[PDB]
């Protein structure tokens, strides 16, 4: 590579071809894997010159090389991205979205994705400068298959950054504007486009129920459920995230997920060899068992209660904690017959085993579930049978020990249980 000093001499030469050669040299320096000298390039004052080269319509090579150099400065820290924005790059890149040269308009898409990806303020500023209409215009083709794969992947990722981040969430009118295009990308056949479309949907559904409703109304749940069964882990992860977000919403929003057949995929998700997939699938289950009694019944009907017993029995501890929540939700909302069923599936022994955890919150969750199960047992007059079960698999030992526990709610719920049933 060139030195930064030589790049500066070329860029300050006032000879457009010398400036092109030095901009290309900078692009190569900034494209190296180990520690590209971004700050040295910023300190040398080169950003405003790069930004002015974005406007040289008669020299499309220097437009491309500067766009690439600025993309890579903006891919850095927030302070580095700020230096690019402060140089005037946002309106200059938006102008380039119209370039007749596909490789230049693509580089402008990529640069705007890095700027918007910095955070909600720069995402919103990219939107205020008018990026959404020209971005969407690049995808206004009858069939996405006619576009180059790399080009489409970059556009999808850039749109996902316009969906990303909270405090605030993206402007409602901007979301409404992008969503039809996002739904087309969600039906495309390329694995990377599908993964970034799912991530964008997972960001739009990460928020209040009004934001979930905007997405659900576009009819995407069936396609998300199909992507839940993809063989590519990079697709399953965000598709499950988005479905999990959606079932944190109203009971009607949760019912769309069940109606689209999502629960049939959960035997595999709840046994997935990727720990994070098991964890988020169990989290999703816990929000479904916080639903209506007819939604609990669908969990039962799909055979999923043995799978919750299994994850409660053996899983990463974080997954076991989501399974505990799923059990407490189930027993808090369920009918007596549904709670009887849960006990017949074997829930008591793995519940009791988890009471040796050194995590105060899971103990509270488990003691809540035990109390809910006892309350069901009182309506059957079978509290005595339950106490025996709980003693026989070692739970009474631990419940008694928890009377001596430091946390207040723990020893209180613990003492109550023994006074009332033991």
């Amino acid at each position: 590579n060139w030195s930064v000093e030589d790049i500066v001499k070329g860029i300050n030469s006032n000879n457009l071809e010398s400036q092109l050669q030095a901009t290309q040299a900078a692009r190569k320096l900034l494209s190296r894997e180990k520690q590209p000298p971004i700050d040295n390039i910023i300190r040398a004052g080169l950003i405003p010159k790069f930004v002015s080269f974005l406007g040289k319509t008669d020299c499309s090579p220097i437009q491309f090389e500067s766009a690439w150099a600025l993309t890579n400065i903006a891919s850095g820290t927030s302070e580095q991205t700020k230096a690019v924005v402060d140089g005037g790059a946002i309106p200059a890149f938006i102008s380039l979205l119209a370039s007749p040269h596909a490789h230049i308009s693509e580089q402008a898409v990529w640069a705007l994705g890095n700027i918007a990806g910095d955070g909600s303020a720069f995402r919103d500023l990219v939107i205020k400068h008018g990026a959404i209409d020209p971005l969407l215009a690049l995808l206004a083709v009858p069939d996405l298959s006619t576009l180059a794969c790399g080009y489409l992947r970059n556009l999808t990722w850039t749109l996902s950054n316009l969906c990303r981040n909270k405090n605030p969430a993206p402007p409602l009118d901007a979301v409404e504007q992008i969503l039809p295009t996002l739904v087309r990308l969600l039906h495309h056949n390329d694995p990377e486009v599908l993964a970034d479309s799912c991530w964008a949907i997972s960001y739009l559904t990460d928020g209040p129920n009004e934001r979930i409703e905007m997405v659900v109304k576009k009819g995407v749940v069936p396609q998300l459920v199909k992507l839940l069964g993809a063989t590519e882990l990079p697709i399953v992860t965000p598709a499950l995230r988005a479905i999990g977000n959606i079932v944190t919403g109203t009971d009607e929003q949760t019912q769309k997920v069940i109606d689209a057949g999502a629960l049939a995929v959960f035997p595999s998700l709840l046994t997935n060899p990727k720990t994070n997939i098991q964890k988020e699938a169990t989290w999703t289950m816990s929000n479904i068992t916080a639903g209506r009694q007819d939604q609990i019944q669908q969990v039962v009907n799909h055979g999923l209660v043995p799978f919750l017993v299994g994850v409660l029995s053996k899983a990463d501890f974080k997954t076991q904690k989501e399974a505990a929540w799923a059990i407490t939700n189930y027993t808090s909302g369920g009918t007596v017959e549904q709670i009887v069923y849960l006990v017949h599936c074997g829930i008591i022994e793995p519940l009791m085993n988890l009471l040796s955890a050194k995590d105060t919150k899971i103990i509270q969750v488990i003691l809540d579930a035990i109390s809910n199960i006892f309350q069901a047992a009182e309506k059957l007059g079978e509290t005595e049978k339950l106490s025996i079960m709980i003693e026989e698999c070692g739970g009474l030992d631990k419940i008694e020990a928890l009377q001596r526990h430091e946390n207040e709610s723990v020893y209180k719920a613990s003492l109550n249980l023994i006074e009332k049933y033991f």
Binding site: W157, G244, T248
Partner: peptide, 22 residues
């Protein structure tokens, strides 16, 4: 009541920035 939103960190989301290496 009962529903629990998931609080994610940056590491649990797709990367927000990408440099072009070639």
């Amino acid at each position: 009541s009962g529903k629990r939103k998931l609080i994610t960190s940056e590491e649990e989301r797709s990367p927000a920035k990408r440099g072009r290496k070639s």
